[PDB]
Amino acid sequence: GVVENLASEQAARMVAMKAATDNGGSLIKELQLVYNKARQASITQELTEIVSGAA
Amino acid sequence: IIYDDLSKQAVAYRQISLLLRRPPGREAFPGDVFYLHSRLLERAARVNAEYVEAFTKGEVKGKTGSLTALPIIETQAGDVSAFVP
Amino acid sequence: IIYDDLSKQAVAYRQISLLLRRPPGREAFPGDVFYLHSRLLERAARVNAEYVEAFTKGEVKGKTGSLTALPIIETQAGDVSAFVP
Amino acid sequence: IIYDDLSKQAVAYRQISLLLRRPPGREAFPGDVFYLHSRLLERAARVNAEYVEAFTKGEVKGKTGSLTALPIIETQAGDVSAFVP
Amino acid sequence: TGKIVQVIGAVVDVEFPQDAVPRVYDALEVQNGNERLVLEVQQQLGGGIVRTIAMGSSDGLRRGLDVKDLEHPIEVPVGKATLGRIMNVLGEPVDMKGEIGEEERWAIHRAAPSYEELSNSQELLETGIKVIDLMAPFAKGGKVGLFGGAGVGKTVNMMELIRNIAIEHSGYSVFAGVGERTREGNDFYHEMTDSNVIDKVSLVYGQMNEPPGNRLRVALTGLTMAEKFRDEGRDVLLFVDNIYRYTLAGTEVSALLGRMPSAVGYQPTLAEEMGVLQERITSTKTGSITSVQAVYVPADDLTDPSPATTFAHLDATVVLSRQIASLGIYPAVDPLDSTSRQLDPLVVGQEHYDTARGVQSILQRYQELKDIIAILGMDELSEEDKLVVARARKIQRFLSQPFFVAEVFTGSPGKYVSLKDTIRGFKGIMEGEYDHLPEQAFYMVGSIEEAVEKAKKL
Amino acid sequence: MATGKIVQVIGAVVDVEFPQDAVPRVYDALEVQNGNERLVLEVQQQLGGGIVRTIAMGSSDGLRRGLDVKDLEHPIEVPVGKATLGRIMNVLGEPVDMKGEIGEEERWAIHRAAPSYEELSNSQELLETGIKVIDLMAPFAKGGKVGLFGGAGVGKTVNMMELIRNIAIEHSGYSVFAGVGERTREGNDFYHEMTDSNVIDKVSLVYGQMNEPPGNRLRVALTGLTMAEKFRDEGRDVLLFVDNIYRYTLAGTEVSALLGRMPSAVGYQPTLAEEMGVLQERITSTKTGSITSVQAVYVPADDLTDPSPATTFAHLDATVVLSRQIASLGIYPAVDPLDSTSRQLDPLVVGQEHYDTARGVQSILQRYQELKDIIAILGMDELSEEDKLVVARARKIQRFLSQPFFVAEVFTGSPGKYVSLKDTIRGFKGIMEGEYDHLPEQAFYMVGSIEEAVEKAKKL
Amino acid sequence: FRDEGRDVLLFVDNIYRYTLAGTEVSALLGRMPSAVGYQPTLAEEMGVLQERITSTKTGSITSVQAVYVPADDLTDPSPATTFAHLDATVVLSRQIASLGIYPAVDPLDSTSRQL
Ligand SMILES: Nc1ncnc2c1ncn2[C@@H]1O[C@H](COP(=O)(O)OP(=O)(O)OP(=O)(O)O)[C@@H](O)[C@H]1O
Ligand SMILES: Nc1ncnc2c1ncn2[C@@H]1O[C@H](COP(=O)(O)OP(=O)(O)O)[C@@H](O)[C@H]1O
Ligand SMILES: [Mg+2]
């Protein structure tokens, strides 16, 4: 019984870690989209400040 | 009526607006960008028979005219939260 | 003394500066907004007894006066990097 | 040839351009900031024997010549997507 | 007397003889083809030039047209003669009925009541909506603001508030349509007429089709009518269809008025323009205005200057979240951002306050756990953290509610919930009285009895 | 007779004043004597009072105020036709090689309107490249725009030479290569490699080096496109290579910044979309003939939402991705069949057989990329006898994507192959249907068509 | 004191506020702005001040300068510019200071020419 439980433990760990890897990938893609928006916005905002500062 | 890529109409109006030195707002669109789309789509409507009778000068009676509209917008990365969308 | 929303003082000053056509600085505030708030807040001080005696011309002697300021600032999203904060 | 801190050259050229009231671009660098570094770095070259022969009026015949350039750029936070980098 | 000298979009410059220059906010008049156009004076430039905004379409205007100087500001009919009728920004009738039987006309530009005149009140006003009067209850004579992005339910929530309050309330009401859909105005007009409640309501409509000057001034027109009813000594309800459009119509004209851009390109005068409007919506020792306002949030950015400025002016703020709305939980109120001046143990009493703060604490802890849950999954949580999650999810479902105006959308009968039922239900959920029911039992049920009856059939 | 005079010189920007009655029109070309050499100026704006504002097509140093200016009454005009083949030119159409004057017959203005609605073709036709991966998985249309997304080391230029060779020999067309902001070293290398391959006679090269002022790097693309339009008018079908469309975009940004126009989102020029449309809409299939374009694409931060990628992608018909991971397998051409796409790959355009074959290959390779994970994590024992079958077929499909190029013969030592679309469809359909299952997987590598795989297996 | 031939210590309360005063006046002096609101002359002004604080063959100046870092963003042009002029740079981090473990010097960011 102990040995078969140990096999069960390693199998369950493998399954859970696979799920964790996929969920981390999803989180990365979401965060990167947010980042690209923040980058573009900062560029446009400061360039507007500069051009409107030529007065 | 189908309007294909009102995003591209917005881009064209932004070109015209920036060439005229008009101060841009959020992103680089002029504050006029809402009025631009609003006065177009708001035309689409179902008008009551009294309006049709008044406009036709009584030639058409008891009929309700209509104009449905299907504007198309394009979102980057499926981002529904952008300014123009 | 409790100055409530020093930030709205900054906003009113920005309105005045832009309506006077003074050149905008970072985040559209004028450059001297720091001088505004710094000269406001450096008045809160504890003065030694000699200054009090000189000001009162000897009517009050041996007493030290103090002014304590508690300004209030509103952050938008905890963003301390904004110009006024 | 080693150019230390080409970013500092770009900063100096930005200062010159802004004092001369030339229109600013991204991050306030002038429009032709690319042209500066490109026409600097394209001089680093290896030239064939016939070019050397023509230039020296034939006093050197069999040799190629070369100029090798090692420019240095300083990124701020690993942000390789900054303009000059 | 005057001559047009420039036409730039909505802005028209007029020259007058230097001895006759109109005052600021004077109304001018010009014949534009086969119709009359009103212009409102904004600025006096030098040399008798005056800069004005057109209250209508400026197309077809030439330079050199003769302009007539009316000696007064824009003045609109006020009083009971306006009740039951639809009026324009200029105070003109827009329904097909005859002229308005005015007895008096008021200038729409007015000063706010003095500090001495203001009045306090703590009378809690009940609503049929669980989340609003649980998390952010509001009083008679206070201001309520609905904050939300595009398409998250500001109008539907305001229509439920109308149905409940403005029909258990007995006095007059004013509805100001500012830069919103004309279809929605027509629908509202009819369902008022079918219910024969129209004769208690004055309606001013400045919808999106209108050129910018109309959208700019229509809010002041509505406030002027509401102030007439307040100063008569009545208790009045004022509904503003979208306050954001007023600031946006300021933004559209500000550049043409020659004013340097500020912040995100807003007019430099944004705070003053909003404040002078907002300060006039106030209850007074003579009479009380209760106000519900929709506040559009551009790009869902609650840190944008317009929502940020609006937040300080309101007593109760309800924030609608697209992320909740996409779950299909309606009304999509965010209880961790919605807040009220009235959530105070002295006015509400201890049970309500304790229940609200308990709900707030559990939902905050659920936010803290969700980042762990996203990567690891729930199985790693502690057995008390799993209970926190299991209760927080039920709380989120129980905040949902069927609305009568949402009968057409959902197809299920609307529900009205007394405050006592809300407090009892959420206290029972947090105490674990219902830990044995499934989550689906709580979704879109009016009261906790309905949750248990739904649970019997899952 | 020169009639204008220079009145300002501010960097590359030169302002010239003419008589009130003879202002040059926008896009016209002027010239001045900068000491002992002629400098060309292109008109951008007509200001009030007879003043015109221009961008110098060359070095601005040494210009004085008050120099005489000649008004050439046409736009920039470039030589076109057969005389251009095998020659290197600058944006002005002047020979940059040392090989003497170009024997021009005509000179065309580089600024033109795109073909009108009535001139456009009334058909959609595939340009058979002869390359199995491209012809099956990412089919070109005549008149299409194609993006190349591969990096370096991935065989990009050898792929370009193979397309040039097949279109010149197996069709009867010609190619134009536009070096928008080239590296001078790489231009020299590319010229010598095309000489060594003997494809140089088949293609005309217009080179705009990076050391050039921004106007040159902006207009060189239009020069190349004009030569392509000349070959099209002869009735041929033509390839136009743009070496980086991103640098065309950036040249537009630089020029508009020097002109001082108000910038747009992310700091690009406000005219970005129209400049891209002005270039891309000239590349179409006329009733007379077609220009098809292969364009190198760069993504400014790997951000696909940035305005330059967002504008470019709206005009691309097909995307071809080259990966070093496939090149590590020795498979050439190193084209990823799963990330490369083509919108022409629709049943109403390519037909149901082609569509089903490509979809089958896509599904099998996707499944194989899944089962590689199991083979790593758990091993081949886990794999069923049906999953072993899809692995065994996926290896053979992957190797049958390889093909020997006529221009690569010095590497492979094997004569090149040209494979017709029907033959490649038939081969992949065959392997998918389980005939040819019994051959060794190495019988498919670098072979050509399936009828040659059966010959290879007989002796392998 | 240096030209007399003495060895002196120079302490500067905050170098940043000199640059900030320059920023204040720069807009009114008619200069167009650059970067994050900073004056175009930022590097020139910084170098012109910093290149006088050096030890010559006649005498030595040892200097300790405090440098304000806006919002702890060491990317910002003023601190990023002053980094080049020093010999030892000690970086105090709010990430460490939040734990109350003063002196709060970051060992992974601080460095010196003498090491
Ligand atoms: N209580 C509700 N129950 C069901 N659906 C709802 C509810 N509230 C809103 N909705 C859905 O949301 C849609 C939009 O609602 P509403 O018009 O009130 O939004 P809004 O935020 O005021 O929008 P806008 O900014 O466009 O004027 C409704 O048509 C309906 O589909
Ligand atoms: N059909 C082919 N057979 C063998 N090698 C090939 C083939 N096609 C490309 N290659 C490989 O391409 C490599 C060089 O890539 P190349 O296209 O020159 O890179 P770049 O992107 O710098 O032009 C060579 O090592 C060559 O072996
Ligand atoms: Mg609404």
PDB file of N, CA and C in Angstrom, chain A residues 14 18 36 39-40 43-44 47 51, chain F residues 262-263 265-267 303 305-306 377:
ATOM      1  N   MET A  14       3.183  15.254 -11.128  1.00  0.00           N
ATOM      2  CA  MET A  14       3.441  15.547 -12.536  1.00  0.00           C
ATOM      3  C   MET A  14       2.242  16.250 -13.173  1.00  0.00           C
ATOM      4  N   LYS A  18       2.215  20.182 -14.608  1.00  0.00           N
ATOM      5  CA  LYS A  18       1.860  20.481 -15.994  1.00  0.00           C
ATOM      6  C   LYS A  18       0.799  21.576 -16.058  1.00  0.00           C
ATOM      7  N   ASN A  36       2.781  46.227 -23.199  1.00  0.00           N
ATOM      8  CA  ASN A  36       2.895  46.932 -24.472  1.00  0.00           C
ATOM      9  C   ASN A  36       2.004  48.167 -24.490  1.00  0.00           C
ATOM     10  N   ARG A  39       3.815  50.908 -22.375  1.00  0.00           N
ATOM     11  CA  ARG A  39       4.929  51.460 -23.145  1.00  0.00           C
ATOM     12  C   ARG A  39       4.457  52.481 -24.179  1.00  0.00           C
ATOM     13  N   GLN A  40       3.505  52.075 -25.030  1.00  0.00           N
ATOM     14  CA  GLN A  40       3.033  52.976 -26.079  1.00  0.00           C
ATOM     15  C   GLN A  40       2.439  54.248 -25.480  1.00  0.00           C
ATOM     16  N   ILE A  43       5.133  56.699 -24.205  1.00  0.00           N
ATOM     17  CA  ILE A  43       5.787  57.393 -25.313  1.00  0.00           C
ATOM     18  C   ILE A  43       4.905  58.525 -25.823  1.00  0.00           C
ATOM     19  N   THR A  44       3.633  58.222 -26.107  1.00  0.00           N
ATOM     20  CA  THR A  44       2.759  59.245 -26.676  1.00  0.00           C
ATOM     21  C   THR A  44       2.545  60.399 -25.702  1.00  0.00           C
ATOM     22  N   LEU A  47       5.681  62.627 -25.495  1.00  0.00           N
ATOM     23  CA  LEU A  47       5.903  63.352 -26.741  1.00  0.00           C
ATOM     24  C   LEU A  47       4.887  64.473 -26.919  1.00  0.00           C
ATOM     25  N   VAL A  51       5.978  68.380 -27.512  1.00  0.00           N
ATOM     26  CA  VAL A  51       5.562  69.179 -28.664  1.00  0.00           C
ATOM     27  C   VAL A  51       4.713  70.364 -28.219  1.00  0.00           C
TER      28      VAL A  51
ATOM     29  N   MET F 262       3.134  67.663 -36.847  1.00  0.00           N
ATOM     30  CA  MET F 262       2.777  67.142 -35.532  1.00  0.00           C
ATOM     31  C   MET F 262       2.807  65.619 -35.556  1.00  0.00           C
ATOM     32  N   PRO F 263       3.520  64.982 -34.635  1.00  0.00           N
ATOM     33  CA  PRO F 263       3.577  63.522 -34.622  1.00  0.00           C
ATOM     34  C   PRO F 263       2.274  62.913 -34.125  1.00  0.00           C
ATOM     35  N   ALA F 265       0.387  58.896 -32.584  1.00  0.00           N
ATOM     36  CA  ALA F 265       0.601  57.877 -31.566  1.00  0.00           C
ATOM     37  C   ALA F 265       1.958  57.204 -31.746  1.00  0.00           C
ATOM     38  N   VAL F 266       2.574  56.864 -30.613  1.00  0.00           N
ATOM     39  CA  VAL F 266       3.908  56.268 -30.530  1.00  0.00           C
ATOM     40  C   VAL F 266       4.922  57.080 -31.335  1.00  0.00           C
ATOM     41  N   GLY F 267       4.597  58.338 -31.624  1.00  0.00           N
ATOM     42  CA  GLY F 267       5.544  59.232 -32.259  1.00  0.00           C
ATOM     43  C   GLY F 267       5.721  59.073 -33.751  1.00  0.00           C
ATOM     44  N   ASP F 303       6.584  43.703 -30.296  1.00  0.00           N
ATOM     45  CA  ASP F 303       5.236  44.182 -30.018  1.00  0.00           C
ATOM     46  C   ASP F 303       4.468  44.199 -31.333  1.00  0.00           C
ATOM     47  N   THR F 305       1.402  44.972 -31.735  1.00  0.00           N
ATOM     48  CA  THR F 305       0.386  46.015 -31.736  1.00  0.00           C
ATOM     49  C   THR F 305       0.945  47.385 -32.092  1.00  0.00           C
ATOM     50  N   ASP F 306       2.262  47.513 -32.204  1.00  0.00           N
ATOM     51  CA  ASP F 306       2.874  48.791 -32.535  1.00  0.00           C
ATOM     52  C   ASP F 306       2.385  49.250 -33.909  1.00  0.00           C
ATOM     53  N   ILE F 377       8.640  13.355 -21.752  1.00  0.00           N
ATOM     54  CA  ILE F 377       8.241  13.239 -20.354  1.00  0.00           C
ATOM     55  C   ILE F 377       8.051  11.783 -19.937  1.00  0.00           C
TER      56      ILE F 377
END
